[PDB]
């Protein structure tokens, strides 16, 4: 099925790889070559996750836990029942996420859109790749990755934080948190403003960009304007993921002590040492 205006947009062309070969739709979905590789990796990864659940102690969704190998295996593939399965699933994940971003690029090219969406998603892929590839590689063992399990990965997050005694004191983490919180505030204001001009109280005329601009300017003192708020929301949301990648990659590979004692440089500035 198609939207009432959709058919004239369903042209050939805009692919990166494969040409006409996969240039077709399946229901709502665009396929393409990277659609085919997406489904391959998604399917292989998901079934290996189900296999991980089957050989683990429970089918309880919250408790399934496919763990990485012991650190002793270093950068090798471990035995599959001893964490090698987590490694194969990680390759499927990297393939699925990369295929998704390239399929987004093919869709955007077909619609004559800018490449903003694929690159914005690249921010999230960077954080995932930091957690399971880059940081474990810098530490010299794949066993530093997080386990695949809805709550067991939260146990990993807890323990990694307390490896540095007081992870709130990590300076890149403070920035990352500030971006996440500021993003959520900005999203609530942008949503509210557009809705409040487009859905005014009954019997009021539809609002305008001028009213939105005036109100916003009483909130922050300055006008952000229409393109400015979308630049800001993109800067905040993607910057949050980039600073997250920074805050975790410096924890271990570069800083090994507790995070509170990193702040010793501030106490010893020569003006007040």
């Amino acid at each position: 099925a198609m939207l009432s205006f959709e058919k004239k947009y369903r042209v050939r062309g805009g692919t990166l790889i494969g040409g006409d070969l996969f240039d077709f739709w399946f229901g709502p979905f665009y396929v393409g070559f990277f659609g085919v590789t997406t489904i391959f990796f998604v399917t292989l990864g998901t079934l290996l996750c189900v296999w991980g659940a089957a050989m683990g102690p429970t089918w309880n969704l919250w408790q399934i836990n496919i763990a990485p190998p012991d650190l002793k295996y270093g950068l090798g593939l471990a035995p599959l029942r001893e964490g090698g399965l987590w490694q194969i699933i990680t390759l499927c994940a990297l393939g699925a996420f990369g295929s998704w971003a390239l399929r987004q690029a093919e869709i955007a090219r077909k619609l004559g859109m800018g490449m903003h969406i694929p690159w914005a998603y690249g921010g999230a892929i960077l954080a995932y790749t930091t957690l399971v590839v880059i940081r474990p590689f810098l530490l010299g063992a794949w066993g530093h990755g997080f386990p695949y399990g809805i709550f067991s990965h939260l146990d990993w997050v807890s323990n990694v934080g307390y490896q540095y005694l007081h992870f709130h004191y990590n300076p890149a983490h403070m920035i990352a948190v500030t971006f996440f919180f500021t993003n959520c505030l900005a999203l609530a204001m942008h949503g509210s403003l557009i809705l409040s001009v487009t859905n005014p109280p009954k019997g009021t005329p539809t609002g305008t960009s001028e009213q939105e601009n005036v109100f916003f300017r009483d909130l922050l003192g300055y006008s952000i304007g229409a393109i400015g708020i979308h630049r800001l929301g993109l800067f905040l949301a993607v910057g949050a993921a980039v600073w997250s990648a920074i805050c975790i990659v410096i924890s271990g590979p570069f800083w090994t002590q507790g995070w509170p004692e990193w702040w010793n440089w501030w106490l010893n500035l020569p003006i007040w040492k």
């Binding site: 979905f29 429970t58 998603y121 709130h168 609530a188």
Partner: protein
């Protein structure tokens, strides 16, 4: 190399700066518009006049006194040393009352200033809500913004009501940059790991989803801004190809889409539910559940790991400690 719409090379300026359109009574616009070249390169250029009214003026007076009490207590805590006030600033705190007072008024140095600063801050936040609500009505807009702000205030108020429900002001959040993070960590320790609080988990999902949505929506509108997609009100009232292409991108990508209007409803709810589910999770903590990991064991959240140690029965009696009591109020000699 293709123009990315991230930066504007050519701004234009109007010799007059726009004013406020209507309803000037019980309050008036302060200042007058001016232009910022830097703000005009990030986004729109006019730094404006501003509105307060009665509620806004009172909000600032209450909020100034709150901040003044916080800062003066911080500065008193380093003995008025202005070098240490800057050097140590993020470690400084205005700290809640001692626990044995419960809900009684505490001594002034021992949290009496804290409760006073917290009271004026709370009133200031409510008056600022009233300001925003009145201003939305005066511009003839929907009340979507004050209800979004009410959700944040709801979470904030749980840092009053949960200490009230457990019965002691000592459980309140200290005013201080690192101190309130010390409180945040210690709260999760006391109540047995907040990761297993399911309303905390929901709040995180909505916090992450807010970043997902603003990344997706921000990128989507910039990808069609070459076609006027950023003129969203016009695209909502008079759908152009920019709206059609952004609907088709997401439909062809993930199999379903929003509209140019309704994407802003998704945005609004994901932001609002972050702080609303958060507040509920706080209010349940210490009142209904006292150890969230054990609640997770009961309800089946906790993944099993092989035992790292095993206690003998006499170690189970030896290795129980005491709950923490009062600090020693004397300096013992050991001479006999």
């Amino acid at each position: 190399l293709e123009y990315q719409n991230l930066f504007t090379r050519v701004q234009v300026r109007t010799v007059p700066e726009p004013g406020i359109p209507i309803d000037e009574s019980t309050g008036t616009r302060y200042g007058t518009g001016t232009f910022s070249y830097l703000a005009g390169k990030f986004g729109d250029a006019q730094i404006g006049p501003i509105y307060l009214g009665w509620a806004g003026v009172l909000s600032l007076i209450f909020g100034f006194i709150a901040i003044e009490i916080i800062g003066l207590n911080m500065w008193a805590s380093v003995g008025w040393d202005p070098v240490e006030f800057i050097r140590q600033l993020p470690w400084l705190a205005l700290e809640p009352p001692p626990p044995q007072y419960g809900l009684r008024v505490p001594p002034l140095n021992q949290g009496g200033w804290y409760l006073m600063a917290g009271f004026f801050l709370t009133v200031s936040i409510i008056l600022w809500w009233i300001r925003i609500y009145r201003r939305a009505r005066a511009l003839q807009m929907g009340s979507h913004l004050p209800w979004a702000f009410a959700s944040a205030i709801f979470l904030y108020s749980t840092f009053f009501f949960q200490p009230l429900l457990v019965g002691s002001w000592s459980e309140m959040v200290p005013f201080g940059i690192f101190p309130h993070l010390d409180w945040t960590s210690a709260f999760s320790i006391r109540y047995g790991n907040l990761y297993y609080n399911p309303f905390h988990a929901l709040s995180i999902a909505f916090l992450y989803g807010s970043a997902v949505l603003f990344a997706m929506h921000g990128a989507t509108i910039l990808a069609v801004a070459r076609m006027g997609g950023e003129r969203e009100i016009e695209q909502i009232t008079d759908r152009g190809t920019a709206a059609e292409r952004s609907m088709l991108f997401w439909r062809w990508c993930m199999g379903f889409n929003a509209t140019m209007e309704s994407i802003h409803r998704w945005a609004w709810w994901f932001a609002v539910l972050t702080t609303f589910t958060g507040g509920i999770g706080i209010l349940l903590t210490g009142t209904v559940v006292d150890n969230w990991y054990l609640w997770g064991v009961k309800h089946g959240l906790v993944a099993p790991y092989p035992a790292q140690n095993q206690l003998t029965p006499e170690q189970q009696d030896l290795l129980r400690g005491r709950y923490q009591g009062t600090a020693p109020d004397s300096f013992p000699s050991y001479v006999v």
